[PDB]
Design a binder for this molecule. Structure first.
Ligand SMILES: NC[C@@H]1O[C@H](O[C@H]2[C@@H](O)[C@H](O[C@@H]3[C@@H](O)[C@H](N)C[C@H](N)[C@H]3O[C@H]3O[C@H](CO)[C@@H](O)[C@H](O)[C@H]3N)O[C@@H]2CO)[C@H](N)[C@@H](O)[C@@H]1O
Ligand SMILES: [Mg+2]
Ligand SMILES: [Mg+2]
Ligand SMILES: [Mg+2]
Ligand SMILES: [Mg+2]
Ligand SMILES: [Mg+2]
Ligand SMILES: [Mg+2]
Ligand SMILES: [Mg+2]
Ligand SMILES: [Mg+2]
Ligand SMILES: [Mg+2]
Ligand SMILES: [Mg+2]
Ligand SMILES: [Mg+2]
Ligand SMILES: [Mg+2]
Ligand SMILES: [Mg+2]
Ligand SMILES: [Mg+2]
Ligand SMILES: [Mg+2]
Ligand SMILES: [Mg+2]
Ligand SMILES: [Mg+2]
Ligand SMILES: [Mg+2]
Ligand SMILES: [Mg+2]
Ligand SMILES: [Mg+2]
Ligand SMILES: [Mg+2]
Ligand SMILES: [Mg+2]
Ligand SMILES: [Mg+2]
Ligand SMILES: [Mg+2]
Ligand SMILES: [Mg+2]
Ligand SMILES: [Mg+2]
Ligand SMILES: [Mg+2]
Ligand SMILES: [Mg+2]
Ligand SMILES: [Mg+2]
Ligand SMILES: [Mg+2]
Ligand SMILES: [Mg+2]
Ligand SMILES: [Mg+2]
Ligand SMILES: [Mg+2]
Ligand SMILES: [Mg+2]
Ligand SMILES: [Mg+2]
Ligand SMILES: [Mg+2]
Ligand SMILES: [Mg+2]
Ligand SMILES: [Mg+2]
Ligand SMILES: [Mg+2]
Ligand SMILES: [Mg+2]
Ligand SMILES: [Mg+2]
Ligand SMILES: [Mg+2]
Ligand SMILES: [Mg+2]
Ligand SMILES: [Mg+2]
Ligand SMILES: [Mg+2]
Ligand SMILES: [Mg+2]
Ligand SMILES: [Mg+2]
Ligand SMILES: [Mg+2]
Ligand SMILES: [Mg+2]
Ligand SMILES: [Mg+2]
Ligand SMILES: [Mg+2]
Ligand SMILES: [Mg+2]
Ligand SMILES: [Mg+2]
Ligand SMILES: [Mg+2]
Ligand SMILES: [Mg+2]
Ligand SMILES: [Mg+2]
Ligand SMILES: [Mg+2]
Ligand SMILES: [Mg+2]
Ligand SMILES: [Mg+2]
Ligand SMILES: [Mg+2]
Ligand SMILES: [Mg+2]
Ligand SMILES: [Mg+2]
Ligand SMILES: [Mg+2]
Ligand SMILES: [Mg+2]
Ligand SMILES: [Mg+2]
Ligand SMILES: [Mg+2]
Ligand SMILES: [Mg+2]
Ligand SMILES: [Mg+2]
Ligand SMILES: [Mg+2]
Ligand SMILES: [Mg+2]
Ligand SMILES: [Mg+2]
Ligand SMILES: [Mg+2]
Ligand SMILES: [Mg+2]
Ligand SMILES: [Mg+2]
Ligand SMILES: [Mg+2]
Ligand SMILES: [Mg+2]
Ligand SMILES: [Mg+2]
Ligand SMILES: [Mg+2]
Ligand SMILES: [Mg+2]
Ligand SMILES: [Mg+2]
Ligand SMILES: [Mg+2]
Ligand SMILES: [Mg+2]
Ligand SMILES: [Mg+2]
Ligand SMILES: [Mg+2]
Ligand SMILES: [Mg+2]
Ligand SMILES: [Mg+2]
Ligand SMILES: [Mg+2]
Ligand SMILES: [Mg+2]
Ligand SMILES: [Mg+2]
Ligand SMILES: [Mg+2]
Ligand SMILES: [Mg+2]
Ligand SMILES: [Mg+2]
Ligand SMILES: [Mg+2]
Ligand SMILES: [Mg+2]
Ligand SMILES: [Mg+2]
Ligand SMILES: [Mg+2]
Ligand SMILES: [Mg+2]
Ligand SMILES: [Mg+2]
Ligand SMILES: [Mg+2]
Ligand SMILES: [Mg+2]
Ligand SMILES: [Mg+2]
Ligand SMILES: [Mg+2]
Ligand SMILES: [Mg+2]
Ligand SMILES: [Mg+2]
Ligand SMILES: [Mg+2]
Ligand SMILES: [Mg+2]
Ligand SMILES: [Mg+2]
Ligand SMILES: [Mg+2]
Ligand SMILES: [Mg+2]
Ligand SMILES: [Mg+2]
Ligand SMILES: [Mg+2]
Ligand SMILES: [Mg+2]
Ligand SMILES: [Mg+2]
Ligand SMILES: [Mg+2]
Ligand SMILES: [Mg+2]
Ligand SMILES: [Mg+2]
Ligand SMILES: [Mg+2]
Ligand SMILES: [Mg+2]
Ligand SMILES: [Mg+2]
Ligand SMILES: [Mg+2]
Ligand SMILES: [Mg+2]
Ligand SMILES: [Mg+2]
Ligand SMILES: [Mg+2]
Ligand SMILES: [Mg+2]
Ligand SMILES: [Mg+2]
Ligand SMILES: [Mg+2]
Ligand SMILES: [Mg+2]
Ligand SMILES: [Mg+2]
Ligand SMILES: [Mg+2]
Ligand SMILES: [Mg+2]
Ligand SMILES: [Mg+2]
Ligand SMILES: [Mg+2]
Ligand SMILES: [Mg+2]
Ligand SMILES: [Mg+2]
Ligand SMILES: [Mg+2]
Ligand SMILES: [Mg+2]
Ligand SMILES: [Mg+2]
Ligand SMILES: [Mg+2]
Ligand SMILES: [Mg+2]
Ligand SMILES: [Mg+2]
Ligand SMILES: [Mg+2]
Ligand SMILES: [Mg+2]
Ligand SMILES: [Mg+2]
Ligand SMILES: [Mg+2]
Ligand SMILES: [Mg+2]
Ligand SMILES: [Mg+2]
Ligand SMILES: [Mg+2]
Ligand SMILES: [Mg+2]
Ligand SMILES: [Mg+2]
Ligand SMILES: [Mg+2]
Ligand SMILES: [Mg+2]
Ligand SMILES: [Mg+2]
Ligand SMILES: [Mg+2]
Ligand SMILES: [Mg+2]
Ligand SMILES: [Mg+2]
Ligand SMILES: [Mg+2]
Ligand SMILES: [Mg+2]
Ligand SMILES: [Mg+2]
Ligand SMILES: [Mg+2]
Ligand SMILES: [Mg+2]
Ligand SMILES: [Mg+2]
Ligand SMILES: [Mg+2]
Ligand SMILES: [Mg+2]
Ligand SMILES: [Mg+2]
Ligand SMILES: [Mg+2]
Ligand SMILES: [Mg+2]
Ligand SMILES: [Mg+2]
Ligand SMILES: [Mg+2]
Ligand SMILES: [Mg+2]
Ligand SMILES: [Mg+2]
Ligand SMILES: [Mg+2]
Ligand SMILES: [Mg+2]
Ligand SMILES: [Mg+2]
Ligand SMILES: [Mg+2]
Ligand SMILES: [Mg+2]
Ligand SMILES: [Mg+2]
Ligand SMILES: [Mg+2]
Ligand SMILES: [Mg+2]
Ligand SMILES: [Mg+2]
Ligand SMILES: [Mg+2]
Ligand SMILES: [Mg+2]
Ligand SMILES: [Mg+2]
Lengths: 48, 271
RNA sequence: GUGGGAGAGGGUGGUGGAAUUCCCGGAGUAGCGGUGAAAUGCGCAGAUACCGGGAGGAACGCCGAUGGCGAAGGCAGCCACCUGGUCCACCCGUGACGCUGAGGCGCGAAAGCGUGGGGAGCAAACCGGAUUAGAUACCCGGGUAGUCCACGCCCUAAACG
RNA sequence: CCGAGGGUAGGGCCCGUGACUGGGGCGAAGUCGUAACAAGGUAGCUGUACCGGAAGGUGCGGCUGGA
RNA sequence: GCCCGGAUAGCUCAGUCGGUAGAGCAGGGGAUUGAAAAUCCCCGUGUCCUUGGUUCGAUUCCGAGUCCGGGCACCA
RNA sequence: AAAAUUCUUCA
RNA sequence: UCGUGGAGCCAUGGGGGAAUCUGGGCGGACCACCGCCUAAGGCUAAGUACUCCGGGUGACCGAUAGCGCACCAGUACCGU
RNA sequence: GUGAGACCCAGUGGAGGCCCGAACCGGUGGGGGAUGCAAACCCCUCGGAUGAGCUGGGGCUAGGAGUGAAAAGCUAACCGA
RNA sequence: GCGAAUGCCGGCAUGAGUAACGAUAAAGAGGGUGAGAAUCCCUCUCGCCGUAAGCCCAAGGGUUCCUACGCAAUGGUCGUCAGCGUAGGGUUAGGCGGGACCUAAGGUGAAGCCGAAAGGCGUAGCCGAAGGGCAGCCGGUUAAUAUUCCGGCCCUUCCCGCAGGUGCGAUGGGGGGACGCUCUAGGCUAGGGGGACCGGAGCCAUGGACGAGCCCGGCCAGAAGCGCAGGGUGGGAGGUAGGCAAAUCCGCCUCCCAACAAGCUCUGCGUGGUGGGGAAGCCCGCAACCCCCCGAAGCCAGGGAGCCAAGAAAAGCCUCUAAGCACAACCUGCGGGAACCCGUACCGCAAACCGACACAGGUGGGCGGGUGCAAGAGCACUCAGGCGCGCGGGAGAACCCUCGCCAAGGAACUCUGCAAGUUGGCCCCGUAACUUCGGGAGAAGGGGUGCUCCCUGGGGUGAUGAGCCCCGGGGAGCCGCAGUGAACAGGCUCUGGCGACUGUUUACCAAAAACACAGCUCUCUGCGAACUCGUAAGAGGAGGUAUAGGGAGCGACGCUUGCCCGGUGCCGGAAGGUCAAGGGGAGGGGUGCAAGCCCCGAACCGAAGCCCCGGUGAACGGCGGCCGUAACUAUAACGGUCCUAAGGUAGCGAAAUUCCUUGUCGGGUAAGUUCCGACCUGCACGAAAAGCGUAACGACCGGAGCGCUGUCUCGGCGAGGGACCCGGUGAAAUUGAACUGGCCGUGAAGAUGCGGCCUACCCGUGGCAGGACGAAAAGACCCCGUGGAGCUUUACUGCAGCCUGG
RNA sequence: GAUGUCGGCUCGUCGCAUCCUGGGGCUGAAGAAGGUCCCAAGGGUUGGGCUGUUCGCCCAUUAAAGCGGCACGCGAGCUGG
């Protein structure tokens, strides 16, 4: 039956996008942390 | 008069609709004036703040004139009386000799073809709006302003109307639709006559829907929820509140007077 | 038919003044009320009594009768519109077209019911105070429906001459 | 083919009987009050309405077969 | 089975602090009536449940009991 | 205008 | 150090509201002496802290230890 | 049909949280399954199906908060926080 | 310094060659290939789907597409095969879809407002799409792309020039774009069915047929013009207080003309110069393209009618004028040029998406042929097309699963007819109580159904007459056990309880009597409303205004809804009592030689709240007890008395409530702790936590009947999928170590393990489940911990909020 | 750091304090019936109504419709009222 993960490119970006992270002081601190740690991807990568 | 249906289905037995002959004429709203995307939404910036609203047939809005003093002296012919979905009353479209058109919550009695106007000089007859001071004590008037130049705000619901009780200073007394006696300025306008379509109070929704088409979602009783949801809530199987009638926010709901005491708007009331 | 007459006959709209109750205002003070006697009850938080203004509902004093009109029920302030019945006068017209009337249809006090409105007074029930052997009553103090209007029902009566 | 009749199903009128229940009639001297007949000691009656152990009381209107 | 509450005149119920005990109703006797009611005068009544103990004295304060009452007996 | 209830049975 | 305490001192949201050296604050309520100090404007190196970074040491580890990674690791992989 | 009505017949008409019934949305009873085909499935049967209907896409509301035809249900496979 | 921590990381064991190998749609053979094939390729039989298990498109997935080499691993077996490994190829657009267009919710956000910071609101504007707007149809090619390349026919924008027209000209004004649901008319088209007619390779089989035989196919696109369907639409001429007057455009008045029109326009469909395609068939290569009929849910489209709940925006596009400009500039024709960016493979109800898997699950839109069954997207079969589900071969035990049948009986089964059976469609007769007059109703209970021949009535289409279809009517007669001959396809009734009803809910044990519901009542709220969210600004309420909005209980409808304001809550009380700051300072204290400077501080004046007074029940709530009495006894209409704020009215009653209880009668039954009707000493009904009823409705719960049955007496047989055997692949929880017998004892009280005795050669396979206090989960009950959380309140203490004096 | 809990079903097996059927002593045993006590389980020990019921109470029979234990025997056997 419908499972929790229903892929949608737009949603995925509109939600966890880079621009999206940047708007919120909280998301800003997310990218802050990610870069810090060493993550190769800061934003969940996707392409159109 | 109100249409009645044979019980060829339950609820349809108790169902009744309004007689639409008063309006029978021009069903399609005037492309100008009324045209106004009306935004639906049961909440503000985020959360809901008026429970149980939602759904309900798409409704187009119609802008009406609640301050006929715009066109003082300019008379108009009542072009037609149409149905307004966004209110209990029926509005009436009227072309002015000027050309400009606009709606007016149609008063009880007003008929298509009748001429009407607004102003001091204005004759005392159903449909003409005047400043209170120039209106015959005792006459019934509706769509009464409440403060000079601030627009109509009283007696606008179908069948409502207030009566001029007397003058006194620059003010005049009015017994409002609720029965309260309020002093209102003399310069305050109001259109003569009663609101009309008084049959309204008699339509019987009939089914559970219908009540839905009107945009009102199912409303659930306090004691049906639980301790956390409401204060009546909880109780091992059916129970008498627990005392004393309260709301989901927890304020007494049987008799506890709510209007602000120190409101400067008193001194002008009595009832 | 023509011409005149009397009437609370009926329906609608408008309207007048007196009175009661309530509201505001003044002035005023120790009781008012009610009764067979009282008590309950209202009153020093200022009542009753008096004056001025306002609201509202119901009923129309005198005229008024042992009177009038209506088929009956019933119908009374005033005004206007719509409308029924009726009496006399003239012998003009029709030419027996009449009487009654099972059934049907209509009307039908009050009380009662429905939808909504209205609510001053009165007032079943109900609550007090008395009386009483008791008093689910007669008397007193309160009091709801009702009484009121519109629409629809009900269709009974000592609807009696 | 029709057909006495039998079978199945569904209706109508009718009589009897039934835990129990509602009044009713009648039966010398049981109980409680006393509504009516004399303003019957609140004039009586009456249609309807509600209430009460019971007659009955009160409301509204009507009658006089009361003054 | 456990925890509660009483009981007093013929009846329904008051009261006590440890000294006294009451009322209403009933009832007995007269009065009014022609006679009953009603009403009016007069009047008598108590092991304060039994029970031991304390105390100078107990209906009353303790201990045991009888009766008539009411209230709990849950998690399984 | 009245404070006030009643009277076994059969003759 | 100060928890209303005999509670000053330093700040200050509210109200009231001065003076310019006979001015004005302080010395633990408050007075009196005696003494200290100059508010309502600003700047000021050094001594001090830390270790992304470079070096040097180690009665530090030696691939289940030592950093999570001695290796193409914040990867593979898990999670929206 | 009556004074006029009400009302009564047919015919036309095509209303309705109406009916059977798919697609579709559900999830009644029983059976199986229970290291499954499956972290809720399959079979037979059953509720609704012009509505308070179902559904695609685009949006908004969240942790003592949301949302709730109300179960303390749901809020990314265990929500009295 | 390890042996234990259900310890941690790793490795390897046991169960075990065991379960299992993922739909019971199904296979067989012959050719190839190759080291090796049930499993790869080819052919021929066979079975499965065919509102698909087939085609097309979104989303998502991202090379899985195509070709050549390949087989370690991946694939539940095998593998030469592959969605797998290596390598090389492959995605072509002015017209398709997005962007150099529009706006929606919402987002963002100049200004502007707010907030300790972070930030929150927020006008214009901007962003934002399956909505609006916008120009491509039919073929042909590749191993792999095509509305993209190619062919033919047909278009759209810009730019320039030319010629002829004209007041040209906005981001501004106006029109338009522009809208719901249900039902519908007429033409068309898609699509499909016939043909004796047209075109075809061929075919006479096995008894018959050279046949109006059999089989295959008889279309697609197409400018202008022309037709046939429609859709939109009055022109005039004056005025002109409005369109935030800029207008000759709208809009209003007024009046010549014109009307179920015509004309003007704009689509649809035919037709059209011409281009294209074109089967069954053998060696693999022969072309017609015409005539009838059924016919949309699509088109003409913005058509029509009815209805109440009253049904986006913006741009493009018309039109009006402003600045400006009129050498401009737009408009129409006609030629020339110019025309970018992104996507385009492939999968796409699934093995490529979401479910750790090649997972029996989930996934939006379009096409979805034919025949028959009343219809249909249902059901059976079948086209096109696609599959036989990536382990097989045997055997023919028990046992389980799914499935068929049964003597006599027919619910005796059992908590229960659970389950399964019966019944089942359509046509016709015929249908009760009750009822809100709709319904109950498909009530029940019946009869009919096939095929053949004759006679016969309407309709559409033609043309009135043939065909082709479309509804019937009446007869004769034929064969079966049976005519919806297969498939799909209600068992019926009587009587109670609950809820009126359709509806909603515990995703994953509860679908109900619970929630909701129209409807009734109470209460608040006069507008900058009350109420809600927010520190705020602001927002919802509501671009509403008491016939409206909030809160609360009840819950259609009928008859109704009683008594008690003592306590509590709320409402009303300008008096009193109490009352905090603060006001006021009688009077007192510390100090100073003093003026002073500093403290305490009584009267009285001091709000809300409380006290007090009065109201209030569809506000929280409450709504009694004991003696006595009638001329048989009983019983008690009557009397007395205690207590209260007042003593439970109507109605109902051993009930979803009754303990004593299976009360007690009566009905039903052979028999009835249930059921139905009564009674009433109601442990412990009762009137809007509504009381008593009620037609209709219910996958709701109880009691009965009839019908039919393997539910049962009582079991038997049979089918298929497993189980079993062989070949291939090959797990799991569990597991101190084992060489692991019975009884009577004993033992921490239930011993394979101690004692005594009795049995017992060693080792397996298929079964059964009594024990190993079998596994599983550090018991969910219970208690314990001065553990935790959710909830309550007249627990404590605070806070928001609200009231209030200064 | 779990010994699954009432009743039913299936399958049984055991005790004797025996409900039948066998023997036998008294009897207030005529016969037939019975009563009672002794020996004796070898084998028997029904089908239904009602309730979840064990238990009983009825219905119709019977030679009898025995009492009781095996974790109120038996849920890695079933059922869950
Ligand atoms: N009279 C019969 C009807 O019922 C009622 O009357 C009945 C009763 O009221 C009446 O009862 C009376 C009583 O009132 C009066 N005070 C005492 C008397 N002993 C009784 O009398 C009754 O009972 C006795 C036995 O006890 C019998 O012998 C006698 O016949 C009988 N009538 O007896 C009647 C029975 O017949 C109505 N009042 C009357 O109007 C009506 O018609
Ligand atoms: Mg996942
Ligand atoms: Mg998308
Ligand atoms: Mg991104
Ligand atoms: Mg509700
Ligand atoms: Mg609940
Ligand atoms: Mg509360
Ligand atoms: Mg609460
Ligand atoms: Mg409660
Ligand atoms: Mg309860
Ligand atoms: Mg009064
Ligand atoms: Mg006065
Ligand atoms: Mg005064
Ligand atoms: Mg009159
Ligand atoms: Mg007249
Ligand atoms: Mg003559
Ligand atoms: Mg009448
Ligand atoms: Mg009347
Ligand atoms: Mg009544
Ligand atoms: Mg009534
Ligand atoms: Mg009165
Ligand atoms: Mg007396
Ligand atoms: Mg009237
Ligand atoms: Mg009548
Ligand atoms: Mg008379
Ligand atoms: Mg009788
Ligand atoms: Mg009698
Ligand atoms: Mg009398
Ligand atoms: Mg009398
Ligand atoms: Mg009197
Ligand atoms: Mg009298
Ligand atoms: Mg009478
Ligand atoms: Mg009575
Ligand atoms: Mg009575
Ligand atoms: Mg009585
Ligand atoms: Mg009375
Ligand atoms: Mg009278
Ligand atoms: Mg009369
Ligand atoms: Mg009279
Ligand atoms: Mg008189
Ligand atoms: Mg005595
Ligand atoms: Mg007497
Ligand atoms: Mg006598
Ligand atoms: Mg006597
Ligand atoms: Mg302290
Ligand atoms: Mg200082
Ligand atoms: Mg200082
Ligand atoms: Mg100092
Ligand atoms: Mg200093
Ligand atoms: Mg500095
Ligand atoms: Mg510095
Ligand atoms: Mg490491
Ligand atoms: Mg090593
Ligand atoms: Mg990821
Ligand atoms: Mg007539
Ligand atoms: Mg009709
Ligand atoms: Mg329906
Ligand atoms: Mg199961
Ligand atoms: Mg199982
Ligand atoms: Mg179904
Ligand atoms: Mg249906
Ligand atoms: Mg959505
Ligand atoms: Mg979305
Ligand atoms: Mg939380
Ligand atoms: Mg919901
Ligand atoms: Mg919550
Ligand atoms: Mg160790
Ligand atoms: Mg292993
Ligand atoms: Mg094994
Ligand atoms: Mg095996
Ligand atoms: Mg196997
Ligand atoms: Mg397989
Ligand atoms: Mg070879
Ligand atoms: Mg894609
Ligand atoms: Mg790859
Ligand atoms: Mg090759
Ligand atoms: Mg392999
Ligand atoms: Mg090979
Ligand atoms: Mg491939
Ligand atoms: Mg490959
Ligand atoms: Mg493009
Ligand atoms: Mg560009
Ligand atoms: Mg914003
Ligand atoms: Mg913002
Ligand atoms: Mg855009
Ligand atoms: Mg678009
Ligand atoms: Mg569109
Ligand atoms: Mg579009
Ligand atoms: Mg558009
Ligand atoms: Mg395009
Ligand atoms: Mg084209
Ligand atoms: Mg392809
Ligand atoms: Mg122009
Ligand atoms: Mg425009
Ligand atoms: Mg349009
Ligand atoms: Mg058509
Ligand atoms: Mg065609
Ligand atoms: Mg054909
Ligand atoms: Mg032959
Ligand atoms: Mg065609
Ligand atoms: Mg003009
Ligand atoms: Mg301008
Ligand atoms: Mg053509
Ligand atoms: Mg046709
Ligand atoms: Mg100009
Ligand atoms: Mg070119
Ligand atoms: Mg493609
Ligand atoms: Mg699909
Ligand atoms: Mg996956
Ligand atoms: Mg597979
Ligand atoms: Mg799958
Ligand atoms: Mg789907
Ligand atoms: Mg069919
Ligand atoms: Mg099918
Ligand atoms: Mg059989
Ligand atoms: Mg048989
Ligand atoms: Mg049975
Ligand atoms: Mg049985
Ligand atoms: Mg049973
Ligand atoms: Mg049951
Ligand atoms: Mg069944
Ligand atoms: Mg009848
Ligand atoms: Mg045949
Ligand atoms: Mg069939
Ligand atoms: Mg079926
Ligand atoms: Mg039935
Ligand atoms: Mg229901
Ligand atoms: Mg439905
Ligand atoms: Mg659900
Ligand atoms: Mg559930
Ligand atoms: Mg259900
Ligand atoms: Mg369920
Ligand atoms: Mg708004
Ligand atoms: Mg309200
Ligand atoms: Mg409301
Ligand atoms: Mg309720
Ligand atoms: Mg109810
Ligand atoms: Mg009540
Ligand atoms: Mg009270
Ligand atoms: Mg009170
Ligand atoms: Mg007050
Ligand atoms: Mg003070
Ligand atoms: Mg005060
Ligand atoms: Mg009493
Ligand atoms: Mg006696
Ligand atoms: Mg006696
Ligand atoms: Mg009671
Ligand atoms: Mg009562
Ligand atoms: Mg009873
Ligand atoms: Mg019973
Ligand atoms: Mg009870
Ligand atoms: Mg019982
Ligand atoms: Mg019981
Ligand atoms: Mg019986
Ligand atoms: Mg039962
Ligand atoms: Mg039974
Ligand atoms: Mg019963
Ligand atoms: Mg109750
Ligand atoms: Mg209540
Ligand atoms: Mg009931
Ligand atoms: Mg149901
Ligand atoms: Mg069987
Ligand atoms: Mg088999
Ligand atoms: Mg094997
Ligand atoms: Mg042992
Ligand atoms: Mg050993
Ligand atoms: Mg040993
Ligand atoms: Mg074995
Ligand atoms: Mg075992
Ligand atoms: Mg086993
Ligand atoms: Mg265990
Ligand atoms: Mg534990
Ligand atoms: Mg403690
Ligand atoms: Mg918590
Ligand atoms: Mg406290
Ligand atoms: Mg263990
Ligand atoms: Mg035995
Ligand atoms: Mg046994
Ligand atoms: Mg056991
Ligand atoms: Mg079990
Ligand atoms: Mg066991
Ligand atoms: Mg098991
Ligand atoms: Mg159960």
């Amino acid at each position: 039956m419908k499972r929790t993960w229903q892929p949608n490119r737009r949603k995925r970006a509109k939600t966890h996008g880079f621009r999206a992270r940047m708007r919120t002081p909280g998301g800003r601190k997310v990218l802050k942390r990610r870069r810090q740690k060493g993550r190769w991807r800061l934003t969940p990568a996707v392409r159109k | 008069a109100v249409k009645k249906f044979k019980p060829y289905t339950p609820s349809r037995r108790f169902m009744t609709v309004a007689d639409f002959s008063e309006i029978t004429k021009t069903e399609p709203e005037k492309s100008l004036v009324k045209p106004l995307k009306k935004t639906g939404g049961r909440n503000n910036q985020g959360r809901i703040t008026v429970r149980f609203r939602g759904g309900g047939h798409k409704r187009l809005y119609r802008i009406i004139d609640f301050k006929r003093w715009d066109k003082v002296g300019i008379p108009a012919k009542v072009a037609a009386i149409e149905y307004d979905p966004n209110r209990s009353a029926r509005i009436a479209l009227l072309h002015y000799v000027d050309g400009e058109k606009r709606y007016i919550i149609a008063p009880d009695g007003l008929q298509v073809g009748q001429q009407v106007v607004a102003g001091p000089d204005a004759p005392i007859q159903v449909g003409n709006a005047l400043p209170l001071r120039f209106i015959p004590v005792g006459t019934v008037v509706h769509a009464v302003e409440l403060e000079p130049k601030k627009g109509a705000k009283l007696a606008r619901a179908a069948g409502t109307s207030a009566q001029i009780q007397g003058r006194e200073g620059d003010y005049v007394i009015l017994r409002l639709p609720s029965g309260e006696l309020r002093k209102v300025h003399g310069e305050c306008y109001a259109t003569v006559g009663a609101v009309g379509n008084a049959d309204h109070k008699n339509i019987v929704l009939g089914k559970a829907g219908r009540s839905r088409w009107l945009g009102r979602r199912p409303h659930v009783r306090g004691a049906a929820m639980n301790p956390v949801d409401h204060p009546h809530g909880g109780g091992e199987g059916r129970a008498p509140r627990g005392r004393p009638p309260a709301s989901p926010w927890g304020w007494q709901t049987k008799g506890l007077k709510t209007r602000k005491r120190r409101k400067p708007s008193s001194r002008f009331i009595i009832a």
